[PDB]
Write a protein that holds these residues in place. Structure first.
Motif, mmCIF file in Angstrom:
data_model
loop_
_atom_site.group_PDB
_atom_site.id
_atom_site.type_symbol
_atom_site.label_atom_id
_atom_site.label_comp_id
_atom_site.label_asym_id
_atom_site.label_seq_id
_atom_site.Cartn_x
_atom_site.Cartn_y
_atom_site.Cartn_z
ATOM 1 N N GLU A 21 0.837 -1.203 0.000
ATOM 2 C CA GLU A 21 0.000 0.000 0.000
ATOM 3 C C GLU A 21 0.856 1.230 0.000
ATOM 4 O O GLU A 21 2.101 1.208 0.117
ATOM 5 C CB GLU A 21 -0.953 -0.005 1.226
ATOM 6 N N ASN A 120 -6.917 5.392 6.306
ATOM 7 C CA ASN A 120 -6.422 4.553 5.224
ATOM 8 C C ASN A 120 -5.608 5.265 4.174
ATOM 9 O O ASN A 120 -4.583 4.731 3.741
ATOM 10 C CB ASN A 120 -7.574 3.738 4.578
ATOM 11 N N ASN A 175 -11.778 5.389 1.052
ATOM 12 C CA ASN A 175 -10.529 4.703 0.737
ATOM 13 C C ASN A 175 -9.565 5.664 0.086
ATOM 14 O O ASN A 175 -8.992 6.552 0.747
ATOM 15 C CB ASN A 175 -10.809 3.407 0.021
ATOM 16 N N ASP A 229 -9.884 1.726 -4.758
ATOM 17 C CA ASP A 229 -8.928 1.782 -3.654
ATOM 18 C C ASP A 229 -8.175 3.089 -3.800
ATOM 19 O O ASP A 229 -8.741 4.142 -3.518
ATOM 20 C CB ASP A 229 -8.135 0.484 -3.577
ATOM 21 N N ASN A 272 -3.019 0.483 -4.895
ATOM 22 C CA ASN A 272 -2.676 1.876 -4.827
ATOM 23 C C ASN A 272 -1.590 2.187 -5.845
ATOM 24 O O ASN A 272 -0.994 1.280 -6.436
ATOM 25 C CB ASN A 272 -2.343 2.312 -3.385
HETATM 26 CA CA LIG Z 1 -6.221 2.242 0.332
#
Ligand SMILES: [Ca+2]
Ligand SMILES: [Ca+2]
Length: 314
Positions: A21, A120, A175, A229, A272
């Protein structure tokens, strides 16, 4: 199609990063990834890594914990005035992480004295305000919860004057997040992904921590488990959005709606993305293999806040 699909060559960058991420470049051009989903004895022990782009070798710079509660670091932005990372953490809220691996927790509570929620992803605007998604429930030491099923995810703005301001609530897993700027640099639109609902939401940014005009801005294809995302703008203000579970990154034009293009990935779960400064190269994290890749886009990225100058002229 229409929707047109492109199939660029994906080159492997690094491997074996649980929940890979928050790809980010710092002001020196070093590259970092977070590993939110590392666990030790079934408890969170997430990591912040530096990646050597020549070798793919990984170094863990920070394994954050507060009072024994391990972090779930999930998203990053680089600061402008100091070479330090702002890291959204699903257990610990917002962290500021130095290159030496030391860190600080920024908020246990918001500006109204409510317990902070776990975060996040985040996006700096060019005014230096940090817009943050908070899909978890309360931070540690509260029992961990997340809004994949129920609508308790929130949005924050952490301002230049140090206020952690809750600016919206009642999302089902907010997100990715991004800020659109006028050509002059003024921030004017906030985009927020709501993962399972297959939506992107927009707001008008009226000023620091001031958003209005909430709208369903974009529609994410598919009925797979997952959805949007992470996201980032290219230099023409097209929004690239990882559609986790779909095998694609979606490309929205400036006006949103449906994607204008899709990018097929050689994996199902893009998470991501981030541009390398001064290049067309997009680094992509993904959760099929828990790995990082790169590919060439059509144009350079939109400059991040850390690429702008406090004491610029033009
Ligand atoms: Ca994320
Ligand atoms: Ca990014």
């Amino acid at each position: 199609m229409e929707i047109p699909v492109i199939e660029p060559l994906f080159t492997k960058v690094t491997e074996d990063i649980p929940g890979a991420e928050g790809p980010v470049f710092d002001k020196n051009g070093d590259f970092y990834i977070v590993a939110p989903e590392v666990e030790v004895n079934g408890k969170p022990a997430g990591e912040i890594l530096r990646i050597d782009l020549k070798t793919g070798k990984k170094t863990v710079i920070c394994k954050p914990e507060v009072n024994g509660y391990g972090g779930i670091p999930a998203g990053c932005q680089c600061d402008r005035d100091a070479n330090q990372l702002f890291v959204a953490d699903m257990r610990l809220g917002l962290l500021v992480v130095q290159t030496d691996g030391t860190f600080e927790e920024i908020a246990k509570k918001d500006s109204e004295g409510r317990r902070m929620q776990g975060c996040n992803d985040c996006a700096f605007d060019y005014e230096g305000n940090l817009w943050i998604t908070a899909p978890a429930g309360e931070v540690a030491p509260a029992d961990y919860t997340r809004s994949m099923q129920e609508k308790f995810g929130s949005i924050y703005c952490f301002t230049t004057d140090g206020q952690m301001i809750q600016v919206d609530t009642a999302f089902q897993f907010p997100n990715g997040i991004a800020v659109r700027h006028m050509n002059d640099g003024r921030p004017y639109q906030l985009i927020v992904a709501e993962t399972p609902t297959k939506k992107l939401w927009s707001y008008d940014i009226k000023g620091p921590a001031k958003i209005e005009n909430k709208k369903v801005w974009g529609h994410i294809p598919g009925t797979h488990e997952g959805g949007a995302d992470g996201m980032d703008f290219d230099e023409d203000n097209n929004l690239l959005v990882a559609n986790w579970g779909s095998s694609h990154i979606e490309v929205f034009g400036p006006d949103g709606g449906q994607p204008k293009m899709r990018i097929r990935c050689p994996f199902e779960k893009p998470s991501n993305l981030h541009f390398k400064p001064q290049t067309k190269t997009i680094f992509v994290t993904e959760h099929e293999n828990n790995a990082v890749w790169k590919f060439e886009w059509q144009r350079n990225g939109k400059k991040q806040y850390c690429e702008t100058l406090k004491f610029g002229i033009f």
